[PDB]
Amino acid sequence: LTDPLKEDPTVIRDEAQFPEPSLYFKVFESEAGEPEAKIRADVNKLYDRWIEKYGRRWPEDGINTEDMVWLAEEANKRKRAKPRPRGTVAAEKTEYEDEFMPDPGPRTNYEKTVAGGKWVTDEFESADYEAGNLEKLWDMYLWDREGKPTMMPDTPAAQQEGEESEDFDDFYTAYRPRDVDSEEAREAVWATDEFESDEDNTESEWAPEYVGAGLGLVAEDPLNPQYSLRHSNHPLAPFPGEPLKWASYVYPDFTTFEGLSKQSIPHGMGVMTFGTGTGAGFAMSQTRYGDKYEGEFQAGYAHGLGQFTSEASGEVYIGEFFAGQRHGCGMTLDMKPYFYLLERGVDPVEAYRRTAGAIMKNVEVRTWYRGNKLGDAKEDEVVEINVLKDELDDPFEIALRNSLHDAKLRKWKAMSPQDKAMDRIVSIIERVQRRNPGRFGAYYREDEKGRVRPVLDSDGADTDFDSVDMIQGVDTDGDLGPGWEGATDSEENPMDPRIRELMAAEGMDDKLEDEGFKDTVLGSAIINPYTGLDMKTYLDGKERHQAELVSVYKASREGRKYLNKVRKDLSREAEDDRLARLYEQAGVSKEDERRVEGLAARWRRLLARRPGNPLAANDSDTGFETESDMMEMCDIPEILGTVQEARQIVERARMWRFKPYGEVGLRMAQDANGSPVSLMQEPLHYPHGTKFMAPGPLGLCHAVPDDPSLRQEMAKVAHNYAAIYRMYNFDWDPEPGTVQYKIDQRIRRAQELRNNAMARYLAAADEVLR
């Protein structure tokens, strides 16, 4: 077969017009929040329509009267829920004539328009049609005979008290009978303009994605995974808009940064030296004057892989960073004695010989979580301990749980999407009720006299919900958490009981005052006139209180006598019988259940925080709020690999350190007396017999100064340069026994296998189609 990788490049000939019809006439789903694209979309449709009639993407005559009708109704359709018409009128036209508009290719508007329909007649104002649409949507009467609103206030808006006038097309749409959705409300009041009659909500506006390091992602194009970073601010995102710049910043506190930057923020790779203060997200107490961090930066944070070096203290850390703190695997060395001997006039070789062994013995490998070292709170043994705890249960519970695990999967495999949504809603409701179950049936009662009264508890509380945790939060178990100036490093030093009770009483009277203010401010408005639901209870979330109160009042003797006077002028049993039917239908008597319960409890349970793995990826019902304060600790090979890659990252990042003419280079490169020095970084001048450093033919003409350490350094630099070179230049005909040869062999094998698979698919298609 022909070699795909050895085609003769004698004649190169491409045929592609720059305004490419493949790339130009196309609408992307990536362009969703952009309004102008909508117009383009319609235009594109028109093009296709013309191609369907003339085949030239250009219309004879021009845009006709029926093109707008087609593009309005027939072109694109939107999802509705359900119609339910009727065939008989329920109103009378005996009132002032021309009150209701009449209602009896005539198929539709487009069919009539293409059959010679002028559509030129104009009549009536828009407000009448919008009011009629709202009235039919409500299925009520919103205006009386005189024309004054019946469901909204008709008096002029009081400028005092903060109220302002509101049009009907807004009030009758922001306040609706809950069987009308936002889309139908917008469609009823003729909201058509794309640019001015639409706004983006605070919680629904488009924002760039967050990908972090961007390692684990679904690749839309498998060959190039960088294509999936186009919607983020990742340093390697394609075409940011402004080129990444080699920033060399000196801050007023003498903190210096040198490396890649996006906009004006450090971004990509670089080296940062700390002066007074801090930077790169580090804590104020971590750094000193002269410490440095080399490695990856992201959004001004030391995020990724790097190395932190402190010349004053000697600590050296190599490894992973998240945000501005150590998070992941890391390796720690303490080279303090080496620096101590170096600063006291000892040559480096002698100091290394003296202090190599002690430093090598004290090398530490660790796993860090949010800047804290793990391994002291038995983080390593958590999983095994939890497995043993799960194994310590009674056999019946374990068997039932294991059967339920398979039953859930088998049930979910065959459910409909609507059934899945309902199931997830039920699960969410159950999870919520596991913390705050409503006091249904215990909100209102009747006293001895028969008067309805609220049902309080052993305290001054009507429901378990408190509005003070909204500003302070709640832990996983139920405790609140830190507050303003909470002090009490450990709460084993509690507050005095007298102060506690006094403050509790003061909080109770404050709650009473708050309730009084809320009532006197919001209780006058009416939300639901059928049940007397005011705005205060509606906005406090106590609608079920009113729902129970209505039934309690109507069932009371006083309520019954009032109803008589004005007239003068699931259940527990259902669940029980369903459970009994389920028990009977399976052939399991209650005696068997009692026997099994006795066997489990008296014979097994008497013989001798939810179950599961605390560190689990898939958890069915999660809530995305429970937080793990630990991670699987790195093993030695993983730490070694992390250090090996971090050293590569540091070496690659240390290439932005001495920009030729930059502020840091001009102001921080000094001799012994502190005066500036003329660094040999001229692009054309190589003085004092250093022309061997020229990376060209000129360098070969001159000789090296004959220093073994310099020769080793040059050899290492040459090795790095060759390693960089090999990644962009290949051989046309590789020799057998080399890596590139096996790569080419595998590529050819892949092509052959794909061709065979396609041939088999074609054979199957031919068999099916004939």
Binding site: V11, M655, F658
Partner: protein
Amino acid sequence: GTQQELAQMEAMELATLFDMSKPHPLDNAAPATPWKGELRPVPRKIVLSPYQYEMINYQRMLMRKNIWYYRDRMNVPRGPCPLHVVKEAWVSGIVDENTLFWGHGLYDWLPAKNIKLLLPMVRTPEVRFATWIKRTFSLKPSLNRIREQRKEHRDPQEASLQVELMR
């Protein structure tokens, strides 16, 4: 029968074909013809599409204000280099197509010939003529003299960078 087994085996092979840790029998195999060192044939006739013309124009627009940097043998960045400074350094024989350069549109340091449009900018006809003169009459005799004078340049292992300077 056998067809289905062969298809399943081929699917299994496709599953692990690009797993570079797994050895494969087609590695270091005997080619259909005996191996001889070949080179890619040089193209003769090139016909650019308008797409390529406009892409080149756009790239030239993006890089018309760039300032370049390059690295020496000691791995030190060297000088703020506008286009004419780069041309002078190329003519003087200080840099060549293998030097590591950096500009605005890149993320890392790459060889000069691997940057999209850097060699066409430098290589004006005058630059070509001057670099040919410099290679032929200044650097080559000096290299011969330094090779003859000092034995530290091993005859069997001699670099050929001066020969290809003209390009």
